[PDB]
């Protein structure tokens, strides 16, 4: 069985859809997360990253200081999946909420954005 972590104050999931041209910046942003995610700064909370890069399958990561060093720990390696399918997003959120329960949850949605516009908006212009 998988045993959930002890409940805490806050769990934040960063959901990074980087299977696109933003790849290199997702990695620099994860670097910056690592710099900030000290035991003192996380204040008891959980920082979980769903990282969906170009060229390789998605991975679930926990960023946590252990023995004085912030580690980027591999939790799960997924098989190829559509990270833009709502049911996949919901499933990942469910994995995270179940394993890292908290009084408060936050979500960072990281990717390209175009407001409400249809993704085929160019076809609806002329």
């Amino acid at each position: 069985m998988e045993t959930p972590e002890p409940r805490t104050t806050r769990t934040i999931l960063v959901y990074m859809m980087a299977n696109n041209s933003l790849n290199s910046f997702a990695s620099k942003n994860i670097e910056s997360m690592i710099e900030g995610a000290t035991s003192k700064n996380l204040n008891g909370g959980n920082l979980i990253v769903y990282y969906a890069p170009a060229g390789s399958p998605p991975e679930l990561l926990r960023i946590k200081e252990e023995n004085g060093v912030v580690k980027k720990i591999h939790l799960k390696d997924y098989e190829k999946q559509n990270s833009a399918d709502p049911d996949v997003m919901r499933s990942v959120i469910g994995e995270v909420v179940s394993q890292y329960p908290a009084d408060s949850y936050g979500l960072v949605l990281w990717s390209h954005g175009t407001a409400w516009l249809p993704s085929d908006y160019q076809n609806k212009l002329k």
Binding site: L42, V88, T114, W116, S119
Partner: protein
């Protein structure tokens, strides 16, 4: 839309399906263009707060190192997190950033105020509006300009009393916002001045874009909420 994976995207109503209701205290969009009144409305039951940019954000993105202790604070104040983002892009070589924080519980009152302005207006009236009177906040590739400052659009259509009600509701919903003097748009390789700024964009329907309006009416909840 939000989130590109190969050829596939999440349309805004699909994103709402991917999110549980009433779980997250906040959603932070590290993404262009997501501080859109339509998007915040679609996602109103998915978070108590939405922190996002109405325009484009440099690819370097949000300053996670500095944000981290604020994101995990006991006294979480997302205005602080947005201030950290904004202040990062100050005296910088690309000093271009816009941010707003929307309190989703106030969107229903805002919806009512907007409904009372827009529901009786004709499409010809909307199509007639002079774009020079409104701040454009979007320059996507191939776009003639679709997303404008929300306040500027409504100001063209409201009576003095309707407008006063709107601003009262808007200030309760947009509880924090900031913008640099200019915003940078990748599809033109230039930064353009922001003369008017409320923190959110809105679709301004145009006679030349009937397919866009058709999709908006059927797929974006805000349309039926305030135009009907």
């Amino acid at each position: 839309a939000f989130g590109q994976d190969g050829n596939n995207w999440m349309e805004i109503d699909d994103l709402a399906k991917g999110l549980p209701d009433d779980l997250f205290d906040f959603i932070l969009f590290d993404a262009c263009y997501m501080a859109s009144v339509e998007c915040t409305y679609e996602l109103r039951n998915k978070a108590e707060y939405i922190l996002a940019s109405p325009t484009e954000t440099m690819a370097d993105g949000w300053p996670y190192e500095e944000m981290m202790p604020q994101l995990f604070a006991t006294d979480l104040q997302l205005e602080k997190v947005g201030e950290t983002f904004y202040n990062h892009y100050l005296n910088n070589t690309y000093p271009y950033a816009t941010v707003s924080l929307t309190k989703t519980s106030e969107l229903d009152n805002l919806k009512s105020a907007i409904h009372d302005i827009l529901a009786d207006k004709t499409e010809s009236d909307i199509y007639s509006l002079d774009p020079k009177n409104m701040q454009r906040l979007e320059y996507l590739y191939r776009s003639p300009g679709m997303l404008y400052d929300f306040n500027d659009y409504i100001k063209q259509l409201a009576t003095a009393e309707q407008y006063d009600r709107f601003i009262s509701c808007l200030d309760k919903a947009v509880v924090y916002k900031a913008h640099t003097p200019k915003s940078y748009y990748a599809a033109i390789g230039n930064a353009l001045p922001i003369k008017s700024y409320c923190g959110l964009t809105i679709f301004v329907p145009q006679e030349s874009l009937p397919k866009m309006l058709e999709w908006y009416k059927q797929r974006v909840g805000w349309y039926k909420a305030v135009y009907e």
